[PDB]
Amino acid sequence: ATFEIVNRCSYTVWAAASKGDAALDAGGRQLNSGESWTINVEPGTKGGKIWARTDCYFDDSGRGICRTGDCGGLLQCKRFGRPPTTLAEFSLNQYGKDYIDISNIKGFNVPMDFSPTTRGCRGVRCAADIVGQCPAKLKAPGGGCNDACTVFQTSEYCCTTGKCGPTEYSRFFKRLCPDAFSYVLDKPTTVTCPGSSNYRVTFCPTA
């Protein structure tokens, strides 16, 4: 499957793509404002994620740091990134279909659209100004808006026991972005797409 990753933000981002225990394609790349990077993701990839990283530094060997979304200091990510990270999430070729969503469960750093470029379904978007409107207790001093599990480490926010409800913090993310997951047991906003669809992830889709 191809994923076209497009940075429409006015700032550079370092895109990342991983399934948690491995890179997808090269795992990460710099995207200046307006640049597009197309990756190939193996069919059947389960639990894949794409995100943006901000304010990164890397040396000539590809090691360094990002202020949001850092994946163990690597330019080419092979693990998931440090919150806060808006997440494009997908599982491909699962019994004939693909499944896509956007999640704020790991916080928000950059607005995003995640849409098919092929027929048969609809995209999802979280492009409100969540960082500007972020509750004071969730603001990440490094940049971004953390989720409440990251900040407070409770069973209720992290849904550790499997039985959590919405919270004042999850409801903030859900009010600003109704079509993204705001907590683990949110009513799902997953879209079913034809198996083997192709996609575009656009950072900062609106102005």
Swiss-Prot record:
GO cellular component, one term: cytoplasmic vesicle
Pfam family, one: Thaumatin
Keyword annotations of the record: Cytoplasmic vesicle, Disulfide bond, Signal, Taste-modifying protein
Organism this protein belongs to: Thaumatococcus daniellii
Name of the molecule in the record: Thaumatin II
Compartments, record wording: Cytoplasmic vesicle
SUPFAM superfamilies in alphabetical order: Osmotin, thaumatin-like protein (SSF49870)
Primary localization class, coarse: cytoplasm
Family listed: Belongs to the thaumatin family.
PROSITE patterns linked to this entry: THAUMATIN_1, THAUMATIN_2
Keyword Disulfide bond on entry: yes
InterPro entries: Osmotin/thaumatin-like_sf, Thaumatin, Thaumatin_CS
